[PDB]
Amino acid sequence: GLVPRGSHMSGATEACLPAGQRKSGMNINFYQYSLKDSSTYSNAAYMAYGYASKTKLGSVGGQTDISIDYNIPCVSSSGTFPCPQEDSYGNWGCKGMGACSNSQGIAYWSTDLFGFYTTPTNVTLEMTGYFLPPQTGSYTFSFATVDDSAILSVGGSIAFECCAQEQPPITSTNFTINGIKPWDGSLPDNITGTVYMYAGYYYPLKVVYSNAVAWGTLPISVELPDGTTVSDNFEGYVYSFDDDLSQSNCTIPDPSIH
Ligand SMILES: OC[C@H]1O[C@H](O[C@H]2[C@@H](O)[C@H](O)[C@@H](CO)O[C@@H]2O)[C@@H](O)[C@@H](O)[C@@H]1O
Ligand SMILES: [Ca+2]
Ligand SMILES: [Ca+2]
Numbered sequence: 237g238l239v240p241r242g243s244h245m246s247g248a249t250e251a252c253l254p255a256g257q258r259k260s261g262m263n264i265n266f267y268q269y270s271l272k273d274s275s276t277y278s279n280a281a282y283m284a285y286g287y288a289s290k291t292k293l294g295s296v297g298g299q300t301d302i303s304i305d306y307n308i309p310c311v312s313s314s315g316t317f318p319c320p321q322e323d324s325y326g327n328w329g330c331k332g333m334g335a336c337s338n339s340q341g342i343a344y345w346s347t348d349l350f351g352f353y354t355t356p357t358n359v360t361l362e363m364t365g366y367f368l369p370p371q372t373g374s375y376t377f378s379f380a381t382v383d384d385s386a387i388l389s390v391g392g393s394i395a396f397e398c399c400a401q402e403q404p405p406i407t408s409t410n411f412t413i414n415g416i417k418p419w420d421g422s423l424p425d426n427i428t429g430t431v432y433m434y435a436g437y438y439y440p441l442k443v444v445y446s447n448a449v450a451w452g453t454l455p456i457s458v459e460l461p462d463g464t465t466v467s468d469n470f471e472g473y474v475y476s477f478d479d480d481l482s483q484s485n486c487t488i489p490d491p492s493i494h
């Protein structure tokens with residue numbers, strides 16, 4: 237046929253073509269999250285949009301290295317150093333450092349999350365931007381692990397609305413990756429999610445991440461249609477655009493026929 241048929245039952249992921257100045261990286265907003273609150277981050281509504289009803293702590297823009305790997309301090313005989321969780325032991329010490337004198341259960345202040353001075357022990361953050369596929373085909377996003385709770389959403393009207401990156405969060409709970417901490421204490425039952433994407437369209441991307449205590453971990457990757465994997469550093473794939481609510485043609489409801 238002269239034209240492609242289109243994805244069945246309007247199945248294509250909505251994307252966008254913002255016309256404004258493109259900036260490298262994602263925007264990261266930080267919101268208050270209570271130390272040792274083991275319930276708030278287990279709600280879908282909280283993880284999709286409720287986080288923004290808490291106090292906003294600040295923000296940083298242009299972030300391309302988006303994985304989280306926050307290690308709490310061990311106050312040791314030789315000074316204060318971050319302890320990889322797998323090296324913690326006993327009650328407690330850190331391998332190569334001896335016994336730690338400090339509590340695993342208090343808040344700690346650090347710039348480890350994107351250079352922003354906050355409490356990485358207890359915080360929620362929202363990463364927003366647009367993912368630019370260089371190749372048409374299936375992309376599989378993943379979280380290697382989640383500590384404590386996280387979601388990843390891709391697509392117009394799922395992550396956020398086209399040309400409206402800076403708006404308050406939309407209410408969609410149609411997560412691409414549901415890594416929400418289960419109430420039961422188990423592990424989310426699936427921390428990959430696949431999206432079919434058309435080269436050259438900008439796909440809204442949102443990551444919401446929460447830590448309630450101690451270590452914070454979120455290693456983010458994407459497998460490209462060519463079978464290669466991009467991990468942690470998404471430079472060249474993620475971009476931001478200032479809001480332009482006036483750009484009439486910004487939304488591409490079906491990139492397969494556009
Ligand atoms: O999943 C909750 C929590 O688990 C682990 O922390 C536990 C323990 O090791 C800590 O001493 C106390 C601090 O109050 O909290 C838990 O009982 C860590 O894996 C942590 O990152 C995680 O949030
Ligand atoms: Ca919409
Ligand atoms: Ca934690």
Ligand SMILES: [Cl-]
Pocket residue numbers: 329330331332333334335
């Ligand atoms: Cl040791």
Ligand code: NA
Pocket residue numbers: 305306307320321451453
């Ligand atoms: Na770590």
Ligand code: NA
Pocket residue numbers: 308309310316317318
């Ligand atoms: Na430290």
